[PDB]
Design a protein around this nucleic acid. Sequence first.
DNA 1: ATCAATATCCACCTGCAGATTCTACCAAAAGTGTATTTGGAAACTGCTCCATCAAAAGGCATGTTCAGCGGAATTCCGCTGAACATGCCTTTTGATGGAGCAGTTTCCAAATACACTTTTGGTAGAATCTGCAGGTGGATATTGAT
DNA 2: ATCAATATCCACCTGCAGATTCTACCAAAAGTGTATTTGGAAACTGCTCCATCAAAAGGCATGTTCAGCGGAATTCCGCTGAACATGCCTTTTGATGGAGCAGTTTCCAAATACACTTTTGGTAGAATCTGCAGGTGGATATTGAT
Lengths: 100, 103, 107, 103, 95, 95, 80, 86
Amino acid sequence: KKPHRYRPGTVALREIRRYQKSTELLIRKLPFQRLVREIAQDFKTDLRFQSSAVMALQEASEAYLVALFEDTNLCAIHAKRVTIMPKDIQLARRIRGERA
Amino acid sequence: GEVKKPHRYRPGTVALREIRRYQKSTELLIRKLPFQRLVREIAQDFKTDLRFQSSAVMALQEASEAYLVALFEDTNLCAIHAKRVTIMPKDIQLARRIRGERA
Amino acid sequence: AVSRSQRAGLQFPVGRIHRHLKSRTTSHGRVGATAAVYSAAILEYLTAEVLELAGNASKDLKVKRITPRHLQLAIRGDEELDSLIKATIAGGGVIPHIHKSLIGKKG
Amino acid sequence: AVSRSQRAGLQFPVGRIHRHLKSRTTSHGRVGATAAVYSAAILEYLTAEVLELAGNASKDLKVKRITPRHLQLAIRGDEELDSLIKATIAGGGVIPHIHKSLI
Amino acid sequence: KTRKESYAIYVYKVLKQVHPDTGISSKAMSIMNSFVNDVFERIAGEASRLAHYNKRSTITSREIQTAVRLLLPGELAKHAVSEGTKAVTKYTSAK
Amino acid sequence: KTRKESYAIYVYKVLKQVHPDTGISSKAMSIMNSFVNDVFERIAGEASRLAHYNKRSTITSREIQTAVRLLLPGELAKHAVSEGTKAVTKYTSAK
Amino acid sequence: RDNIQGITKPAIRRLARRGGVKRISGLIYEETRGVLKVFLENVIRDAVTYTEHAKRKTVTAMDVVYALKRQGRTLYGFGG
Amino acid sequence: RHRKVLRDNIQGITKPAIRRLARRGGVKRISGLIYEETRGVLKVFLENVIRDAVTYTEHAKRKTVTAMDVVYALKRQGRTLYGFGG
DNA sequence: ATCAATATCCACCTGCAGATTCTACCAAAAGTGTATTTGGAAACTGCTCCATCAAAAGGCATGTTCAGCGGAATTCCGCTGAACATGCCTTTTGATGGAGCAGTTTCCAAATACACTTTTGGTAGAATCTGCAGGTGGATATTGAT
DNA sequence: ATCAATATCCACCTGCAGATTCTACCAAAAGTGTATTTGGAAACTGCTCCATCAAAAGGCATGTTCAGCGGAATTCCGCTGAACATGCCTTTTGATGGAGCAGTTTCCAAATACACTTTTGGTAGAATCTGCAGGTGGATATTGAT
Ligand SMILES: [Mn+2]
Ligand SMILES: [Mn+2]
Ligand SMILES: [Mn+2]
Ligand SMILES: [Mn+2]
Ligand SMILES: [Mn+2]
Ligand SMILES: [Mn+2]
Ligand SMILES: [Mn+2]
Ligand SMILES: [Mn+2]
Ligand SMILES: [Mn+2]
Ligand SMILES: [Mn+2]
Ligand SMILES: [Mn+2]
Ligand SMILES: [Mn+2]
Ligand SMILES: [Mn+2]
Ligand SMILES: [Mn+2]
Ligand SMILES: [Mn+2]
């Protein structure tokens, strides 16, 4: 029936624009809250969390991953690609001194 | 030939020989007096009539060579990531953008 | 009464800043009479500098209240503040930007 | 009269460390009896860990005195010490290494 | 309920002289307060390190001043220093 | 006055315990002296803030311990904490 | 379903877009997750250490803020 | 009672010295433009460090830049140095 | 695969620079002993807000399909490494005057320690106010097929 | 170049979350007046080490020549991600006991402070000791032509 398809890369550019325009969080909340609580459980049991604490952790993480994706993209582009790959994330963390 | 082809190492062989050599030693690699003049010249352009304890200058040299050497390791990772073995200005620039510096 | 702050022509709390400096001290140390004044004027100045740029960022968006996004726009947009403020601004997002080589279709 | 170091079974100076804490105090700041003791133990322990490794390296090089080069092989060589000690060690050079794609 | 000091009302006053008809959201005020606390900390910290390097016990406006030159980028420092000398002067000359 | 404190005699003692027949060049001792000062400034610093955040004015062995857990990497922390604990306990066992 | 997998491709894809990224390899999703796990371990470990020291059982925004600052990742907007 | 004008001393960081530094950093092949780039990067680095060191010197009302001044300046910028102080 | 040409590794060897071993001294450090002070652990508790649980919302997992990206292959120009000749400037060793740093001592402008009075910023509960996020509609731009 | 499918844009609109203007209470600030205290500037000056000039020689920079091979351009194909639309399961939202986080008050173990006596790390200086830098030489790689 209705045959309409955008070319690979057109929606993607639209997404970049939409998401750089906005400021909301992008990881769904409960899933992130669960991850935080599980990681914490290995350092101390029966822990509770202020709500503002989980939120600060989410704001810090997303600012960190977004900035890591910017350097990662620079590494892919340096290698003449437009697709980020694990070696680009690795090169970027290696130079940042984070190593892993 | 007569005394035949005078021996010649292939490009890269002496370069590897060099990395092994400098990597195992610890001396300062920049000549001392020229580095001292560079220091005096930059200092002077900030404030005239300054003197220097000789160890102050040695501290700046150690810091500078430690900074350059670590920057060439990062630059070398950017070249190899790009499938080259030759470092280029764009490799140095990439390393500094990611390190969060600039100029 | 007058008050240290009013006496110095500043909006920032000289008395309070002074008290605070007596606590960031070397065991038994002292704080100069004018040190608080100077500090208060420095904080007042930077606060003004950021509000001024954040304030322009919001007017050029035809809105009345400065938000975190406005603060992020003003800070990353000025070379000197960007350099001085490395903190993550919660809720600010990033400056829009697409690398020339990704934007395309080319010809 | 037993020194506080001797009383704690330490080589690092407790009295001095206590003194230095009292002066980095912060106004009405107080320094507990045992804070300096615990501090001298952490300091003596880290120092022991670094010398143990530097000393092993000066030994695999058939030599008697530890040099900055030995301190640097020992520190860059240990994951945790490397992570804890970011300072530049004057005269220590680097750990030999050549990327496989250059050989 | 114990009092939490904040720089909010002073940030708001400075806001009013700068854009008399502009407001500021709660989340934005919280950011400004973090910013003011952060800068005062970096400054008092450098100034007391300065004092200590020089075997001195008093944090004077002169340490605050060198600390500003060490912490702020060129222009920002130029004006800030200028704003500082100007407040001290106006305060020195008074009753 | 002129006399400058150093940690060198103490570093020598420790070196003799771990490597009885090993010496240390003056350059190397200089590095060890900086290393020790650096680590101490970092621990006292963390202990102060730590105390501050908790509205406490006293820096105890408890603040030093937490300072140590924040500053050292996993395994170094455990061994250091156990040596810190051991020396406090012994010290208080005499008083 | 493991918690770390609650951080989904779509969410990872949105973070990359805000990061100006155009095309994503399939292996990127697991790698991003490992990276986030490490970042969160480093920060929570420091937050919880501040909690225990204060003798509480509730990690507070301030504990997270002081942990982030310690790591050179200062955050504004949540106190401190 | 005399002189000597310092100019262009950045060319004292010669091509062989830069190649030695790159060898220690593990570099095998160097393009022709690396040398002027390295000089520019060293100039900036030294400017930033010398600027802070001279600020400590003046603050202390001295005319002599001390190893300690350099060491505190390297520390402020996150580049701690061991071997003179830290 | 042999083979000629160099480079490197390694252990012995030796003049001296950097080190380890006394001698005498001294301010400051460091510990013993009372006296005075108080920070904050310890117990009790009121009420914020964190965990949990039900229902209403909406983003994610899935499988197909093929456009276009990444990388393998191939070619080749020109730039960078290796080698060499030539000689300059850095390094090394020493002495010299004296700039400026740093120690010691005297004395006051500036800073602290109370006591006393007065204004103020923070907090609580409330009343009325409003900027703007989010939704509409219709005009126009954009994108992709033909 | 011509449609058709959609995204984007902007003028306008309104409800309620977030902001604000209002009143009042009070622990704690913040300012004034008066008395004691002390850091550090000013001054004299001992004493280190910084700039400098001198000379001699070889380590090392510079400049050139030449050709190996690396970088970059092009071509091409298989396959991997982007787009999409079907299909329901997880997140989000709003309501409710009770856990801890805070506020309060008690009171002693602990930490300050000062006076006496004692132990010590820093340092100045003639001095006899020793590890190793760096030179030498030959045994074992390593390299590159063929
Ligand atoms: Mn000049
Ligand atoms: Mn770009
Ligand atoms: Mn490698
Ligand atoms: Mn009390
Ligand atoms: Mn392609
Ligand atoms: Mn003089
Ligand atoms: Mn009021
Ligand atoms: Mn809108
Ligand atoms: Mn519409
Ligand atoms: Mn005095
Ligand atoms: Mn020449
Ligand atoms: Mn190639
Ligand atoms: Mn309870
Ligand atoms: Mn002694
Ligand atoms: Mn040797």
